[PDB]
Q: What sequence folds into this?
């Protein structure tokens, strides 16, 4: 196929990249000269600006880092593909997240928010809110998380309705944020409401972690009511999602699946091929494995001994 | 001009009868007169073909269709033949466009040309027919008829989406991109033998992802959302897991990056971004070959395999060469080359010792079949004036005893210069592709 | 050297292997016949008793899952409808 991008621009950008390991003051001027000589839109200059932010964040240079990020925000909506742009931006957001200047983190976030609003790119503005939302749940903040959830929900009404038919993808993130919200609060009334609202309209392509979290709440709700088949199914998918992603809660979710599997009065073994293999011999799961072995063998004396021992 | 004249005749007749006669005076006269005038004139004028119904629709006369709809609606059995003639014209237009005879038609242009026809007819329906249900039913039924005619069509359809997704320059705004693909699947619904279409659709979505990244992301999830809304589970869910495994790849690397932050890696592992996918969604390319690995990647793969077998026990990895890329730093300046995990073995042997031939790379490499030849020719055969692997017996065909050299090619002064001629004839046509079909 | 590799972006595929275990319906093993083949039939001549692989990547004896499909059809390890994607190992 081939397509002549530019001969001079790529040379000068990588020349500055070769000078990155040298003194930045000469390199950053060289990167700026690339941007001035960039002229036409800067797929390479976008990389140069991305590298400049990475370099400046090393030597604690925020003032122009966000000002050039605003240039990147305008650079998002000109030529660069959405896939590369938000992957670059997500890496920028993750790279800023490395330090602990949380004030600068959210100043970066709020500048990101309104910029993506302008170019009708609420797709990434939703993702940044989800990125900011997940961070909020980790440190238990709800004052602005609720505002985010309302704004994300506000972007999701089709005026008369409260949901779209393609933003069911978005409602996955919205409810997953709310699932973790009421996990700490232990609000069973909202937990079922979230799950019921989720189930019907969430039908879409989810992120594996989101699906596992949604199903994990459903298994808890079903177990707290009495349904064993539904709780077992929800724990099954949540553990399946955890395996693909790699969340540490997979072992804890497996314990949920084992208990639900034993509660439905079925001799079926909930390890099989789904629960890999080594998880049977895991020290935190070996006690559960012994419970399954005693449950299948109907050894009440051995079962009760394991209950008291562990 | 007759339709305007008869409309005026009705208007003056109804005006006279309500003002010069008694109060009601309208039911018997109007119905019989309207029925006779409309029935005979419509039949005799469409045979004449002198700017009748088919001609006044071909040139795009919005007013003529609008006045015809508002007049023929009063007489029963008028819309029935109106849609029948409209469907017949659509059939004639469809056959002249879905014609299969003649090779050399662009699949992207074929759908796009037909796509404009659907939008043009929809615009006429909205502007003139006032969104009549009968007209919508007939065009929907007609579109179901002429779209599933040819056999070689699901293959062409999947290529149309591939062109749209590969590059978005044509209509940079996502609204134009999404509209083209929105009503494109309207054509998809009117297609029987979905199994053969799915298999073609499975294969090319891999082809979209396995060459270059940075397609769209956000709309890629969006176009998947419409996919599950319209098709079903079994064949489509496999696709939705492929892009899901792409998310699995980076998330698995997020854990791998955490290990990179904790433990520093030596020269075997300077700069690695490995990827982890599941075989349950991503099909095998051709055979998952078993070629050799350069020593620096050998250590990197060994470290990753050891890490994956220690902290991620319960699954073992299989190495392959028909996937990925690399950045080969060459060295008057230092320009980094690019090899898509095909020439890495060939260049590594050259670094160990130059002046090799086809026999050298086929005896001490455990190299697969002609896919080597197609990969080998990516550096020598069919190359522009940016050659990174030259030979003295320059020929299109690849012989056995030919020596390879290297050229500077300062015309390729690009510190990261990429070789995009890797594909070339990878998916060639005729040799052994039709016989296995 | 003249050419040195700095970056590499290979893709490492993983597949659940050593899927030997137990046909959970028969509780004997993934192979070595089933309860309907070691306790039920005695002749076992011109017989088969293969494995049965589904869309959800689960594995059972062909005899065990087919008989389980009489009453229920929901793959008792989940709520999936258990399409039949393969037979044998
Ligand atoms: Zn069995
Ligand atoms: Zn059997
Ligand atoms: Zn299953």
A:
């Amino acid at each position: 196929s081939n397509s002549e991008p530019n001969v001079d621009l790529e040379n000068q950008y990588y020349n500055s990249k070769a000078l990155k390991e040298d003194d930045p003051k000469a390199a950053l001027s060289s990167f700026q000269k690339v941007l001035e000589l960039e002229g036409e839109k800067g797929e390479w200059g976008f990389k140069a600006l991305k590298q400049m932010i990475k370099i400046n964040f090393k030597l604690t240079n925020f003032p122009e880092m966000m000002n050039r990020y605003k240039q990147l925000l305008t650079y998002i909506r000109s030529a660069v593909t959405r896939n590369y742009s938000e992957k670059s931006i997500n890496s920028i957001l993750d790279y800023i997240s490395t330090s602990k200047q949380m004030d600068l983190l959210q100043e970066f976030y709020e500048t990101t928010l309104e910029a993506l609003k302008d170019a009708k790119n609420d797709r990434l503005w939703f993702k940044t809110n989800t990125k900011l939302g997940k961070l909020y749940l980790e440190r238990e903040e709800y004052g602005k998380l609720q505002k985010i959830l309302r704004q994300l929900h506000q972007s999701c009404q089709t005026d008369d309705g409260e949901d779209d038919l393609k933003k069911g993808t978005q409602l996955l993130e919205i409810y997953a944020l709310e699932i973790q919200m009421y996990t700490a609060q232990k609000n069973n009334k909202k937990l079922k409401a979230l799950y019921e609202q989720s189930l019907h309209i969430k039908s879409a392509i989810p992120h594996p972690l989101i699906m596992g979290v949604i199903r994990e709440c459903g298994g808890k709700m079903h177990l707290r009511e009495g349904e064993f088949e539904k709780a077992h199914t929800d724990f099954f998918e949540a553990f399946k999602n955890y395996d693909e992603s790699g969340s540490p809660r997979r072992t804890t979710c497996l314990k949920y699946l084992v208990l639900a599997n034993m509660l439905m009065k079925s001799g079926i073994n909930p390890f099989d091929s789904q629960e890999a293999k080594p998880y049977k011999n895991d020290p935190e799961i070996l006690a559960m494995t012994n419970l399954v072995s005693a449950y299948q063998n109907n050894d009440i004396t051995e079962f009760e001994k394991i209950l008291k021992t562990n | 001009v007759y339709i305007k004249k008869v409309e005026a005749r009705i208007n003056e007749e109804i005006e006279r009868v309500m003002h010069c006669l008694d109060k009601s005076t309208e039911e018997p006269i109007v119905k019989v007169v309207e029925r006779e005038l409309i029935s005979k004139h419509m039949k005799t004028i469409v045979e004449m073909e002198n700017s009748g119904l088919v001609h006044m629709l071909k040139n795009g006369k919005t007013e003529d269709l609008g006045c015809m709809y508002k007049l023929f609606s009063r007489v029963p059995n008028g819309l029935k033949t109106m849609c029948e003639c409209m469907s017949s014209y659509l059939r004639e237009q469809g056959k002249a466009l879905v014609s299969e005879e003649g090779e050399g038609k662009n699949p992207v242009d074929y759908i796009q040309g037909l796509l404009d026809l659907k939008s043009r007819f929809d615009r006429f329906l909205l502007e003139s027919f006032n969104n009549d249900r009968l007209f919508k039913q007939t065009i929907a039924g007609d579109f179901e008829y002429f779209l599933n005619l040819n056999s070689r069509s699901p293959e062409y359809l999947s290529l149309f989406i591939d062109d749209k997704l590969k590059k978005g320059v044509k209509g940079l705004t996502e609204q134009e991109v999404e509209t083209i693909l929105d009503k494109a699947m309207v054509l998809f619904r009117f297609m029987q033998e979905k199994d053969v279409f799915e298999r073609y659709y499975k294969q090319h979505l891999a082809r979209r992802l396995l060459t270059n990244k940075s397609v769209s992301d956000d709309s890629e999830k969006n176009m998947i959302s419409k996919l599950k809304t319209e098709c079903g589970c079994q064949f489509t869910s496999k696709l939705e897991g492929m892009f899901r495994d792409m998310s699995i790849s980076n998330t698995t690397m997020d854990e791998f990056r955490q290990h990179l932050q904790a433990t520093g890696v030596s020269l075997g592992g300077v700069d690695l971004t490995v990827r982890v996918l599941t075989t349950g969604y991503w099909p095998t390319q051709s055979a998952t070959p078993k070629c050799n690995i350069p020593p620096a990647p050998r250590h990197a793969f060994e470290i990753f395999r050891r890490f994956y077998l220690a902290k991620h026990s319960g699954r073992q990895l299989t190495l392959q060469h028909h996937m990925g890329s690399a950045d080969l730093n060459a060295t008057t300046r230092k320009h980094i080359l690019q090899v898509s995990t095909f020439q890495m073995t060939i260049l590594m042997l050259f670094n160990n010792r130059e002046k090799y031939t086809f026999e050298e790379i086929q005896q001490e490499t455990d190299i697969p079949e002609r896919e080597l030849v197609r990969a080998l020719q990516s550096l020598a055969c069919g190359k522009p004036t940016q050659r990174v692997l030259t030979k003295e017996p320059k020929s299109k065909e690849i012989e056995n005893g030919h020596i390879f050299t290297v050229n500077d090619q300062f015309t390729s002064k690009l510190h990261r210069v990429k070789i995009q001629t890797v594909a070339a004839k990878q998916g060639e046509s005729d040799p052994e592709r039709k016989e296995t079909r | 050297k003249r050419f040195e590799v700095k970056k590499w972006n290979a893709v490492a595929l993983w597949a659940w292997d050593i899927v030997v275990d137990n046909c959970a319906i028969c509780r004997n093993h993934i192979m070595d016949l089933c309860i309907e083949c070691q306790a039920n039939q005695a002749s076992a001549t011109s017989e088969e008793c293969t494995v049965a692989w589904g869309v959800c990547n689960h594995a059972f004896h062909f005899h065990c899952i087919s008989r389980w499909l009489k009453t229920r059809q929901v793959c008792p390890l989940d709520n999936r409808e258990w399409e039949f994607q393969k037979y044998g190992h």
Q: What stands out?
A: The longest helix of chain A spans residues 168-185.
